[PDB]
UniProtKB/Swiss-Prot annotation, chains A, B, D:
Name assigned to this protein: Polyhedrin
Leader sequence residues: 1-20
Organism: Bombyx mori cytoplasmic polyhedrosis virus
Function: Major component of the virus occlusion bodies, which are large proteinaceous structures (polyhedra), that protect the virus from the outside environment for extended periods until they are ingested by insect larvae.
Glycosylation-annotated residues: N21, N76, N227
InterPro entries referenced in this protein's UniProt entry, alphabetically: Cypo_polyhedrin_Cypovirus1 (IPR008464)
Pfam family, one: Cypo_polyhedrin
More about this protein: The sequence of strain H is shown.
Keywords: Glycoprotein, Host cytoplasm, Late protein, Signal, Viral occlusion body
Principal location listed in the UniProt entry: host cell
Gene Ontology CC: host cell cytoplasm; viral occlusion body
Length: 238, 238, 59, 238
């Protein structure tokens, strides 16, 4: 009947979560996954109100294995300028082989912007001719579970020796209202949100460990190398 | 004749580059060069739309040689407070001897601001009496090539034992229009530009290597210790 | 050559790589700290001199 | 009934395996197990057509623990000649305490030959009086499972301080035909088999790990320290 209040409250509890995240009071989140040839995965996450992003150097995206280097500094020198380095190797296995960018479903996809630079942090060959970003939202796939969008994914390989990148990405929380969250009334709150943004960074040994111990316990969206979707659908669901 | 289209297109291609960088769609860039007594040079670069800056601690400006420390931590302690440390040396050679700040020609020089703090990151002796910046644009020299301004330079020595600094610098992209890039219509784009800014950091062994492998390959402006200008002039030039 | 002998070794430049071997000889047989060893060859090329009889080649 | 074709095919699939291995087209295999006092076990395996063997030095049979030596070199010197070394120990625990030789059931036991030398690789005291092998087949026990011979075993202890050995062993694939596999028609194929022979070498921490992760997953024969037989019976069996 309609007197199953445990049922109604369960459905409302999940719907409230879905809707709260999508309100101007909620989070918008981005993740950058860098995939290494040893099968480990670096994740960088940022979670903030209003807008959020991540910006990393070429060096910062390379694999680092905690408590386990001169040569890798020389690799960097030889990637910033051809034959600029004294490295003992042709291809550094610390270079990411691929990147996946994921946004929370509370992003507005039309606001997504990416600055994929070269190894010296120039977006498009020389600064003089560079637009500082590309709007790549059209490339984002919907990660879906049970018919619900649980996130958005952009996946690109770096399979060539010349794929040596710096990377920044940014998205704005959805706002279907005509209230500008950056209007004079609220602009200091957006400034404060820049300070309040929380960052997370970790290297998982395997995609399995990433799925088991990072994605799933936190109810985050993910798309794996086999094109399998992860996440939790909450809108009007028990 | 005027039917040399290869000529006309070459001149237009360079002029378009010059003008694009100076548009509100283009980059503004800053560089901080820290010069060490061993002749090596630390460069920090940031490239962003609308506005850009760099902010570093006292410790972060000191020389670090990758894959090549307890004592240098004690140096820091003895610089934060007189006789505060247990260091085995009078003068740390990891301290910068000089700084050069360079901006791209797309900066508005009247917007440049510098916060040169003491070693505990206070701009002017005590926080209570500190204005958080100085507007130093009047000190910037034009770096010129072939009559064209290719950048702006501020150079200062730190030749005394008491020159122990923290440092931040900021400039705004030129905007001769009456369109405020921070107006309500566009303010979220400036917020996004904070996330999209790309950073680069590297230590070059010698100024020669800096000129050869960092400045010149990227068409950046530079002024060397001999007062020689580097850069590329593009406005109405082949 | 053995499996182990074909793996990358960089002279004058290992416990973990022994455990990699154990985990490749039998699934979950090892205590290695990595999913894929980069010391594994990605490809092989066999070349013979033109003085071979190709119909005698065996692998 | 006789219309259980899944049954008939299962029995044929196993019988074909048994018979193929025993054909002149099949493998003959030998294993040398060296048992150390820390309970670890070195295995050397060789698998080849027609004939197969293993030959190891005194030094090569000693325990080596990967990524975990001057003294052990001196041990060798003091074992090659009495008081020839400057070692800091009476008995090296790296010396094997026992050896087990196992052959596949496709060997002809009457062809087995062993050269158990002294520590300087002399079969019988001085080269001048040495026959280069002993035919030891009469000592091999049948390893049996369910009434089927799954292999052949020779086990000997080295419990005395003077048991310091080099070791080689060899057997020929059974061939009940009158076709000599080394006849002129096929002798180059036996030469090629010397190159095609595949070798395996590994140290297992315990006999348990050897049984679980080496013997059993590969369907190899084994006889453990408790006289227990392992292997798989295939002739006319489901």
């Amino acid at each position: 009947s309609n007197r199953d209040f445990a049922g109604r409250e369960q459905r409302l509890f999940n719907s409230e979560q879905y809707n709260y995240n999508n309100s101007l009071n909620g989070e918008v989140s981005v993740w950058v996954y860098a995939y290494y040839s040893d099968g480990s995965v670096l994740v960088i996450n940022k979670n903030s109100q209003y807008k959020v992003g991540i910006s990393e150097t070429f060096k910062a995206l390379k694999e680092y294995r905690c408590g386990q280097s001169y040569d890798e500094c020389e690799v960097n020198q030889s990637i910033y300028y051809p034959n600029g380095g004294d490295a003992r190797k042709f291809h550094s296995n610390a270079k990411p082989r691929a990147i996946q960018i994921i946004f929370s479903p509370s992003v507005n996809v039309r606001t997504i912007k990416m600055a994929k630079g070269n190894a010296v942090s120039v977006p498009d060959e020389y600064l003089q001719r560079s637009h500082p970003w590309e709007a790549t939202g059209i490339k984002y796939r919907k990660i879906k579970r049970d018919g619900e969008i649980v996130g958005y994914s952009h996946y690109f390989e770096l399979p060539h020796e010349y794929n040596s990148i710096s990377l920044a990405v940014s998205g704005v929380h959805k706002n279907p209202s005509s209230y500008n969250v950056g209007c004079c009334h609220n602009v200091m709150d957006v400034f404060q949100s820049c300070d309040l943004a929380l960052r997370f960074c970790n290297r998982y040994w395997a995609e399995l460990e990433l799925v088991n111990h990072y994605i799933s316990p936190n109810a985050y969206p993910y798309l794996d190398i086999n094109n399998h979707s992860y996440g939790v659908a909450l809108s009007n669901r028990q």
